């Protein structure tokens, strides 16, 4: 019943971009347009300038006429290379023939949708990402969805969530264009420097002849998404035998290091970047053998190579010490030496855990067959006598709460992210 209103479905069929909606809108890609052979089969443009990629959809004017002036919806998956917070103006999706139609661009940390009736009048709505928790840029995938009702409201959703809403004003004389041009284009200066190249990834761009509501929007949101495959910090599939930078949503201003075989979290210097720290590799024990992708319920361990040696993360047995609260069933996570024999001591089960504005997961301590989960992974500061320390000192370190860890499932402190190493 929902797809009954779909009038454009730009997708990657062969290794070609086409309109699978049935209205056969013409699709023509120019310059450097990279298509992805593997899911989500996203295509990729850039602000290179050389032969800047430019995809152009030309819909059946008649179907545009009978759909766009009433109510409609635009949705799609998008991603920006290095969406920093200073970024200059850029038009990314444009459907303005003369001085009328609609347009979608990015500015500082904003993604704005615009309805343009004339050169002297517009009406925009936008999404602004939380800079606080996004120092290295908002470089993750997100599902957008814009809804418009001339006789009511114009709104935009990011990942099934309503972000902004507004009443449409008398935009009489507005002229929708049948042409939609995908291409990164810098807006007319005022910033006045030549910044780095940004890439943009697009997937499943759709347009509906009606104003979809939250429910159908989130239905759509999951409709095309492997909710159960865990994703890495940017939204791509999580993989095994791949180097990652494991972080804790509660402390992104920290990186992983280790002391006397004990994993500690230090403050990163390159705040506007995710380098530093020690890396991790996820090793599978039980999961879909045909993949190297991490799925919920999959059993695994983690390898951390330091000097040149590879260690296994593992749950300690020593009792903890902390200035404030108690040691419920708290065990620190440290590094042991690979025993070439899977120690129950290093076994965990991963679970996808995505939030409106980030991609994380939950790691649980389990046995080999995972029919017994004893606790969950967390983080906190505790008293230690590490390398050279004669006196105990506080260290923020990974931990595993056992006993009844049910009380922590709702804590972002158990939310772990994996930033791949570029």
Curated annotation (Swiss-Prot):
Outcome (variant: residue 390 to L): Receptor-binding domain (RBD) has decreased binding to neurons. Greatly decreased binding to neurons. Whole toxin has greatly decreased toxicity, even less toxic
Record region (Ganglioside-binding loop): 401-415
Effect the entry attributes to changing residue 413 to Y: Receptor-binding domain (RBD) has decreased binding to neurons. Whole toxin has decreased toxicity and decreased binding to mixed gangliosides
Residue numbers spanned by region C-terminus of receptor binding domain (C-RBD): 226-422
Record: residues binding a ganglioside GD1b (d18:1(4E)): 258-261, 278
Compartments (UniProt record): Secreted
Motif (Host ganglioside-binding motif): 388-390
Binding site for a ganglioside GD1a (d18:1(4E)): 251, 379-382, 413
Ranges for region N-terminus of receptor binding domain (N-RBD): 1-225
Functional summary from the UniProt entry: Responsible for host epithelial cell transcytosis, host nerve cell targeting and translocation of light chain (LC) into eukaryotic host cytosol. Composed of 3 subdomains; the translocation domain (TD), and N-terminus and C-terminus of the receptor-binding domain (RBD). The RBD is responsible for the adherence of the toxin to the eukaryotic target cell surface. It simultaneously recognizes 2 polysialated gangliosides coreceptors in close proximity on host synaptic vesicles.
Entry note about domains: Has 3 functional domains; the translocation domain (TD) and the receptor-binding domain (RBD) which is further subdivided into N- and C-terminal domains (N-RBD and C-RBD). The N-terminus of the TD wraps an extended belt around the perimeter of the LC, protecting Zn(2+) in the active site and may be a pseudosubstrate inhibitor which serves as an intramolecular chaperone for the LC prior to its translocation into the host cytosol. The RBD binds transiently exposed coreceptors on the host presynaptic cell membrane. Binds phosphoinositides, which might play a role in membrane-binding.
Name listed for the protein in its UniProt record: Botulinum neurotoxin C heavy chain
Organism: Clostridium botulinum C phage (Clostridium botulinum C bacteriophage)
Taxon lineage: Viruses, Duplodnaviria, Heunggongvirae, Uroviricota, Caudoviricetes
